Design a protein around this ligand. Structure first.
Ligand SMILES: N#C/C=C/c1cc(Cl)cc(Oc2ccc(OCCN3CCOCC3)cc2OCCn2ccc(=O)[nH]c2=O)c1
Lengths: 549, 428
């Protein structure tokens, strides 16, 4: 009989609604007779009470055999009532990350027996939890019950339970301020720097308190000992790591299986350094049926191979020490992928991770570095409550040049240069003023929206002219083409003039990489040149433009 | 404090649920300060802890005062504002003094503490819920709701409006030429007086308000500030739409005339009376960019005609009160930022540029933040409401760092842009 004198949390039904009226006649004698054995023993414990046909509401009742088929179990579908009940404060969303926990001499896990049923339910609301066990086929006045406690699966049970546990812990946590209790779902994770004797007795004091409030705790010893497999982790006394990851070997890969694979790889990346999901997730780009068979690419199998090689030997993360500096360090992997490690110490990491640019058709190395720094700053604020000192493979003046000439407002915490290659540099810079003694190319390009043929060309002050035909293209593509043509046919210093805000837009962004081969070739040419001045004019306003069709 | 007649009942739009908004993660420092502040407010009765049966949430941040080294708690009420004040700009709405922008000097005074003396309608309290977050999700956060009129809520000055009118009545009587407007937690006081007269009158209002029970912790550095600009004062009579400026040059090249024709052509979609014809004919056949083109008589007859056509205001540009105000900002480099405040495209209600110390003091985010505050205050003074910003910054970066440099008690709406290529040269 584990009931409790705990203050109940007042509950309302969603405004303008009422209690679930669902009726259940069905079905079978075997289950019906089995439900009374549970209901009478629950009534004994005071968790439920019989009610009269005063016309209350009703909820469906099921029954099922537990795994191994030893002891039965009762089920209740509260879906209707759940939809009809008020909202509650969100129980918990994220869970603490092990890199953010702090080393403690002793740690104990306690699971609470009977949980919700040990916590009373607001009186006026109990009448909406009413349910009915039928008779056998005979229509006889079958038993009618209702809950005096938190019903399993009801919408309000987890939050109310958490707040109840918190209020119960409060007088204990007062008497014992030097010990730390974390509360998660049905468990409690206690820890202290108390010597193992007084710790072992404190835990027992806690258990006695809890049991005085009607809450069961594991009898034999303290039960669970390290590890400590929690939420896919392994928490060891001096270290944490992920639970073992298994990457399946298959002849065929469905999109579902690639989803599972990318999932496991991502999960693994917080600790194992170097994990690359780019090519494998690139397979998953097209969004379609999850049962489709997707052939792997070569770069995908190479990537997966490198991951398998990384996952070969196990790696460990450490715990947080507030006394020591927090450092984060970033490396470019080179595919548009970046990787980082966070540590207070040289040979041991708090954790690791990766950043990959998804959106945009073209990007920049410095911009991506900045975005990574942003990601890590957010993450560090979340986990440790502060921001790390950064170690970055970028020269001061390179960075300064970029943020000073960048149209967006960016900012970085204090950081120091690390000479570890590959470094981060600006592979070229456009001239901010036109070049004297340089040939001036007037470029244009145009396409037909139907045929998609079009052409790209230039006309220069030296009287030089060229026109090249294109097939299977678009106006933007013909404009980038035209610029590329001017780059190919000119010297080491060149003045280009274009009619398109698009092309000017791509180029002035100073990208060092892109997902179109064209822009890449243009990038190569731009790097190869000593000076390039790109300038814009209104299209079809008749100044220097190309009249070519 | 006291409990005046009942409490002003607050309802919402029919079918409008309370605010449910995520609490951004905070530094340990800021969590600490919030915990202290709220422990105090809990002691003074202003807020109380709440149960799981309260679903609603409003974000909370920690900034510092104005110039002070002491922490201040800033509640972000934007959501609850849209969910109440929209019928509380109607039911209890405060009228806006179109003559406030005329005054030679305007001082802003912080009256927020006033609201704390007044209780909040019981049934409404559950919508003021906020959460002090825990580091690394280690504990469920600390959850309070307000027992008194909260700062940052737009219903608070609306409820206190009558008390404010009454307390202000005597000062208004002795000073009929001074304009006083209440926007949320701030009093905007305009005058045509000289700076000394203005400051003395403002101190008169400070002492008046003070002896009627209103503290105003806007109090200055007192006897000996080591180095500061002590007065916080605006000057709205000088605030207008900045005219577009064509480059002034002695001799021009092909390139320069190209930038000129381009900028003029861009202006044409604002001022319809612009013709670039004679500047186009002065280039024509393909030339080198660096080649110097002589300015003819006809070309400069077009240029000087396009210069003084650009010094006049636009036509049909008026403020639509049924529409939101929009503020775009573009970064100019060297500690300079330019902005426009409009409603429909290319019709600019007000434009401006706000610069500051160029180097070895401030960074980009600090500058953009002060800029947003400046523009917002101008917007309050002029239209009685704040613009929604299109910010040239990465969302997460701003969401992380905006509370470092933020001295205001109100939060404008904002969104983030990647777009503009060419507006830099054109709006500077
Ligand atoms: N099933 C299962 C789940 C198990 C589980 C789950 C969670 Cl979320 C936490 C946990 O243990 C801790 C509990 C409290 C604590 O309190 C720390 C609070 N700070 C406060 C400031 O002082 C320093 C400590 C630190 C802990 O770890 C410290 C590191 N650690 C982890 C595991 C271990 O065996 N030994 C350790 O030493 C256990």
């Amino acid at each position: 009989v584990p009931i409790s004198p705990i203050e109940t949390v007042p509950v309302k039904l969603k405004p303008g609604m009422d209690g679930p009226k669902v009726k259940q006649w069905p079905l079978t004698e075997e289950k019906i007779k089995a439900l009374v054995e549970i209901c009478t023993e629950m009534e004994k414990e005071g968790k439920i009470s019989k009610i009269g046909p005063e016309n209350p509401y009703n909820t469906p009742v099921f029954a099922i055999k537990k795994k191994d088929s030893t002891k039965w179990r009762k089920l209740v579908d509260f879906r209707e009532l759940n939809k009809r009940t008020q909202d509650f404060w969100e129980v918990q969303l994220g869970i603490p990350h092990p890199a953010g926990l702090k080393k403690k001499k002793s740690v104990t896990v306690l699971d609470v027996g009977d949980a919700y049923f040990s916590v009373p339910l607001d009186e006026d609301f109990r009448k909406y939890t009413a349910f009915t066990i039928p008779s056998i086929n005979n229509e006889t006045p079958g038993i009618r019950y209702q809950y005096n406690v938190l019903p399993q699966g009801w919408k309000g049970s987890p939050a109310i339970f958490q707040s109840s546990m918190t209020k119960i812990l409060e007088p204990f946590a007062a008497q014992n301020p030097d010990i730390v209790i974390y509360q998660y779902m049905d468990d409690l994770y206690v820890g202290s720097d108390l010597e193992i004797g007084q710790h072992r007795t404190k835990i027992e004091e806690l258990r006695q308190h809890l049991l005085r409030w009607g809450l069961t705790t594991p009898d034999k010893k303290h039960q669970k000992e390290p590890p400590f497999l929690w939420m896919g982790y392994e928490l060891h006394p001096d270290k944490w790591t992920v639970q073992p990851i298994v990457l399946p070997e298959k002849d065929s890969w469905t999109v579902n299986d690639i989803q599972k694979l990318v999932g496991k790889l991502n999960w693994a990346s917080q600790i194992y350094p170097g994990i690359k999901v780019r090519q494998l997730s690139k397979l998953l780009r097209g969004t379609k049926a999850l049962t489709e068979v997707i052939p792997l690419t070569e770069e995908a199998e190479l990537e997966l191979a490198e991951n398998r090689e990384i996952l070969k030997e196990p790696v460990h993360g450490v715990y947080y020490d507030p006394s020591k500096d927090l450092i984060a360090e970033i490396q470019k992997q080179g595919q548009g992928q970046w990787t980082y490690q966070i540590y207070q110490e040289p040979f041991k990491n708090l954790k690791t991770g990766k950043y990959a640019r998804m959106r945009g058709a073209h990007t920049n190395d410095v911009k991506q570095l900045t975005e990574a720094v942003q990601k890590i700053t957010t993450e560090s604020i979340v986990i440790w409550g502060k921001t790390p000192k950064f170690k970055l493979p970028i020269q001061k003046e390179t960075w300064e040049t970029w943020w000073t000439e960048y149209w967006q407002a960016t900012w970085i915490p204090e950081w120091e240069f690390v000479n570890t290659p590959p470094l981060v540099k600006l592979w070229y810079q456009l001239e901010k003023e036109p070049i004297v003694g340089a040939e001036t190319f007037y470029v244009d390009g145009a396409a037909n929206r139907e045929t998609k043929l079009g052409k790209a060309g230039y006309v220069t002050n030296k009287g030089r002219q060229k026109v090249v035909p294109l097939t299977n293209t678009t106006n933007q593509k013909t404009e980038l083409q035209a610029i590329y043509l001017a780059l190919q046919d000119s010297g080491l210093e060149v003045n280009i003039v274009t009619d398109s805000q698009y092309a000017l837009g791509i180029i002035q962004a100073q990208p060092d990489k892109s997902e179109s081969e064209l822009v890449n070739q243009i990038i190569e040419q731009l790097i190869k040149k000593e000076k390039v001045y790109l300038a814009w004019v209104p299209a079809h306003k008749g100044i220097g433009g190309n009249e070519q069709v | 404090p006291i409990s005046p007649i009942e409490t002003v009942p607050v309802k919402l739009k029919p079918g409008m649920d309370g605010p449910k908004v995520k609490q951004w993660p905070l530094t340990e420092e800021k969590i600490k300060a919030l915990v202290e502040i709220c422990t105090e407010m809990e002691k003074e009765g202003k807020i109380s802890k709440i149960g799981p049966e309260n679903p609603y949430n409003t974000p909370v941040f920690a900034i510092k005062k104005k110039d002070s080294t002491k922490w201040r708690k800033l509640v972000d009420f934007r959501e609850l504002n849209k969910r109440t004040q929209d019928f509380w700009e109607v039911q209890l709405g405060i009228p806006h003094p179109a003559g406030l922008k005329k005054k030679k000097s305007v001082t802003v005074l912080d009256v927020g503490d006033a609201y704390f003396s007044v209780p909040l309608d019981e049934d409404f309290r559950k919508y003021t819920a906020f959460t002090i977050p825990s580091i690394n999700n280690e504990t469920p956060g600390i959850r309070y709701q307000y027992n008194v009129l909260p700062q940052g809520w737009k219903g608070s000055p609306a409820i206190f409006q009558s008390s404010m009118t009454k307390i202000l009545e005597p000062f208004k009587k002795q000073n009929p030429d001074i304009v006083i407007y209440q926007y949320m937690d701030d009093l905007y006081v305009g005058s045509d007086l000289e700076i000394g007269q203005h400051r003395t009158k403002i101190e008169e209002l400070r002492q008046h308000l003070l002896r009627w029970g209103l503290t105003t912790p806007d109090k200055k550095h007192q006897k000996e500030p080591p180095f500061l600009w002590m007065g916080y004062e605006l000057h709205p009579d000088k605030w207008t739409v900045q005219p577009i400026v064509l480059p002034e040059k002695d001799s021009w090249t092909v390139n320069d005339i190209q930038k000129l024709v381009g900028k003029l052509n861009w202006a044409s979609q604002i001022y319809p009376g612009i013709k670039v014809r004679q500047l186009s004919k002065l280039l024509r056949g393909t030339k080198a960019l660096t080649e110097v083109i002589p300015l003819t008589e006809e070309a400069e007859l077009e240029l000087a005609e396009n210069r003084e056509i650009l010094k006049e205001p636009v036509h049909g540009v008026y403020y639509d009160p049924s529409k939101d105000l929009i503020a775009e900002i573009q970064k100019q480099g060297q500690g300079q930022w330019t902005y426009q405040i409009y409603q429909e495209p290319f019709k600019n209600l007000k434009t401006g540029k706000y610069a500051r110390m160029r180097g070895a003091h401030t960074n980009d985010v600090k500058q953009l933040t002060e800029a947003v505050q400046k523009i917002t205050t101008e917007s309050i003074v002029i239209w009685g409401k704040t613009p929604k910003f299109k910010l040239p910054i990465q969302k997460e970066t701003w969401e992380t760092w905006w509370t470092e440099y933020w001295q205001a008690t109100w939060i404008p709406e904002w969104e983030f842009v990647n777009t503009p290529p060419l507006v830099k040269l054109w709006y500077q």
